[model samples]
Target chain A: AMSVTKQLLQMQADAHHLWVKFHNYHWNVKGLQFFSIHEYTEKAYEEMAELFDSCAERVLQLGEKAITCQKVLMENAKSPKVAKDCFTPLEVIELIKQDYEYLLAEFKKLNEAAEKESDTTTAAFAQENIAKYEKSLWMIGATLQGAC
Target chain B: MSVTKQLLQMQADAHHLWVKFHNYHWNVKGLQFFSIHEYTEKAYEEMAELFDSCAERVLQLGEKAITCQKVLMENAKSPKVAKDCFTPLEVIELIKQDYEYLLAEFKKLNEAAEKESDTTTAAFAQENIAKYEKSLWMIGATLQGAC
Candidate 1:
């Protein structure tokens, strides 16, 4: 009985991990497009911050607490962690682009599950999250400018 | 000054304002945090795109894009607020003022660059003017939020 709340809590942890990666890159990005890429990651990570909060609150609204333990988050996140110093600016953008793609799929899956369960609230939020992640993918694509 | 220099200045202005938005996002307090945080995030993210494009357009024109924080600080006119103990309404007000200032600056840059036939820079400034105006309007409406 995979509840909508259970799936959302999983997506919540993934968004949290994505936020951490973006925030890390935001602080560390440098080189040719330094200001642009840095701020791009900043914007993303901040949005992910909001998404994390909303997803957790959505879980609470459904009568369950979100999975908040750091160890649990690290273990369950679909997004992976990288060494702080290893990513170049372009590498950071590429990684985040992939994560946004991952999120879009996750939200779509969540949206379908919520719909199947007749959970209008979860369905609506997942749709909104999907739209935002799609926009992120577009923005990152433009930043990459066909360079990958 | 040349269009390249003005474009650099414009990018600096946007970056400064971006920092202000981020600061407000970080320091906003009270019940309005929910709305204010999301609004500030939207503003800064939009401005970040503008900043990137403006700086890169400078480089595309055979000028060095100004990436140095020191230069940006020296050229930017937007003011920063102290990060401690700010109400959400106060944060919105501060950001509204910054947006107004940026709209004025962008208008000036747009006019000068257009007059000089620097279409790229002029277009950039014009785009930024429209964005800041929209941001100002939104902020003004939100200021009427009965809290």
Candidate 2:
């Protein structure tokens, strides 16, 4: 349960960072398709917010404290940052797609760890979130005309 | 009997558009994806804020803002466009129509507010009208196949 708590906090931190990244792209996108791209980013951030909440709440429910400090989350987080420099819509999408893939891989590890400890609840949560990220990967890859 | 009812109806419309904009943001695709996706996001987020404010305004008037999805749908002139897929042009056109309808509703609300001596509601309605009109213009400009 303690290890699961740590893994959940890590997932929450990544979701928080990804939420900001999506907001950044929404604000900075330009060109012919600028309008639509930013809108998609907003939806992505909203969903990310929900994911963050679920992870934190699950950690608390497991009788462990959830990480709430920005500083601590930043220190413990391992997710790659979406570029802060100006980038094309394609570049933004590509970066996010890679992050989602990274997130899925990390979730798999967490899932394995939970199952090894016979924590079916944590394992199920990780599996569910992994599927959600997988769908995002497929959709984003489809938009880019290739598989992630 | 009328002004508060009109305000509630308009509030419902705003909520409906909020949902539709979020839907469009997700399902829109193609060359215009960048532009359309971001644009829809901005509108939906804005509408969500407005939805809250609208309800608050109704509460200020001692009336309830209708929040039932079915009722909101019935009251809204804007058509729903939550679909699995849409071409860039299709999404743009649907949003244009919704904004146009919303613009007209705001006008009616503004008039009703004025008649009832509700300056606050009138001001809010006017502000929404200007925003919706701006949205319509941008949608038109984009559809004209130019920047």
Candidate 3:
């Protein structure tokens, strides 16, 4: 059976990943479609923020141990820092690709660790999130030239 | 009352979008990374190609109409373009975002359309695949700094 605590933690990790990506978009986006893209990004962040709270609550419902604050995650988020130096669009793609690989790796580790401990709850949660992350990474890779 | 024709079309459409995005990525230039970028793009293409075949089978089994290769004006997030041109990653991103939304809509459509006699699995499979695809697209956007 999946352990509730492990499941909860994976939820937190996925939620946190969403949060970091949203924040990255909010801060780094610059281009011709600024107004619409910015507004759309804000909307995404709002939804993600709501989702993060909801997920955290769901984890608690599973009677999983919860981390009290964002302290650990603040340190855990691995989104690439946009340089003060502006970059070309392709450069931006590179950053996204690298960051995504890291996210996938992290989720894999989280899932494997949970599974090894026979914490199905966390394992399942991590697996679900890992699938998402991997798919996303694939999409991002596709955008980079269909990586063929 | 939903149509099997539409449901089958949805599968084709879904698979097409997956391929289209990967195609964009493959040909896109001036994005970020150049070296080793092709590997990821190829992986997506392989995935798209595999899914495209699966979708065709779904259409066949559902007894839905076969996809019209000549009909280039099908509603999609992208306009039809010649097969070999570099596109911006940003453009591909825009297209994918729509695919995610459409995947969700199709899932609902499949659920409502499949006859109960079609086997419980037919309904379940469509719904589950839709969920999986939707989740994938959402996560993919996560890399670009949020979704």
Candidate 4:
């Protein structure tokens, strides 16, 4: 009946992580190449923004008991710190791979939990979204097959 | 017959730069959280892959010549490097604007080339139509009719 449940919480975390990442890229870019990179980053964040809303709406639309809470919602988010030493392109690649891997792991945790509770509905939801995140991971992994 | 060799060369150079930057995003590392790190790089590279290949096809269609040796072509690109401290949303928002400008510029160049009756340029312009069309779709992420 519900598209989301307590078991789907992990996906919310993953989506938040994605949103934060998009925002971070928006604020910090610089130098001579500003126009091109700056604009490009912003567009991506908007797309993420749309998808993030879609997921959040999905949570509410399903009429689940678990209401959205930013503080609690962010408790397990894998977002970057307000400030890091400063990143280069190489660092960006490595960090995302790690983030994607972390979320994928969380998905598995929830998937198992859903099954334990005999919530096939939730389990199915978790798996479907987990696979979606994994697909993006694969796309990035394949794209950045090499690092320097 | 030349198809305004300058345009072809410029397109190729831009493609190369875009691809390289994208590669840097995926591979380069220095600071911050993992998700923040990866997405910025991924978007650039993904765009590069989509654009560069299409531009190459334009050249392949005998639309224009990619004269790599020309200094003017090399100077045309406005490149972007990753920032050490970008927020996540910033990345997406920026890309949308970048593509916006690019799509427009390509359209103008394509039309001018067509008006000149430069078949190579016109054919290449057709290639641009394909690329820009897909780019618009990707940006909007919209749905379409079935065949």
TM-score for chain A, candidates 1 onward in order: 0.87, 0.88, 0.60, 0.60
Query: Which portions of model 3 miss their true places by more than 4 Å?
Result: A1-21, A33-51, A54-65, A70-73, A76-91, A146-148, B1-147
After the best TM-score superposition of candidate 1, give how far the Cα of residue A13 lies from its true spot, in angstroms.
24
Candidate 3 chain A minimal-lDDT segment of 10 residues: A79-88
lDDT of residue A101 for candidate 3: 68
- What is the model-wide C-alpha lDDT for candidate 4? 0.51
Those runs of model 2 whose alpha carbons end farther than 4 Å from true positions after fitting are: A1-148, B145-147
lDDT per prediction? 0.73, 0.73, 0.54, 0.51
Instruction: Supply DockQ values for each candidate.
Output: 0.03, 0.02, 0.03, 0.02
Q: Write the per-residue lDDT of candidate 4 for residues B1-147, one digit (tens) a residue.
A: 233454544454454444333333333334533664465456554543434344444544545223221232244454454442234344444455555656665666677677776566566556766776776676555223356
lDDT of 3 by residue, A1-148 (tens): 2444554455565557666675566567677755554565576567556646755775676665555567865654444454444434455556657755665665566666666777666555555655555555655555667422
Q: In candidate 4 chain A, what residue range of length 10 has the lowest lDDT sum?
A: A64-73
Per-residue C-alpha lDDT of model 4 across residues A30-115, encoded as one tens digit per residue? 45554554465556554544444444444544554232333344565544433442344444555657756766786687678767
Tens-place lDDT per residue, model 1, A115-144, is: 889998889888888888788788789988
DockQ of 3: 0.03
Q: Model 2's DockQ?
A: 0.02
Q: What is the per-residue lDDT of model 2 for residues A1-148, given as tens digits with 9 covering 90 to 100?
A: 5677778888887876665456557655657777788678778777876676678667766866555444455566677764353457897788888878988998998898798779898888888978998998988889889545
lDDT of 3 by residue, B1-147 (tens): 344544454555555566665656566666454632564475456445544544443443434344565442253323455555554555445555544555565565556544532323244346556655865666576447633
Q: What is the TM-score of each predicted model, taking all chains together?
A: 0.50, 0.51, 0.41, 0.37
Error of 3 at A119 (Å): 3.3
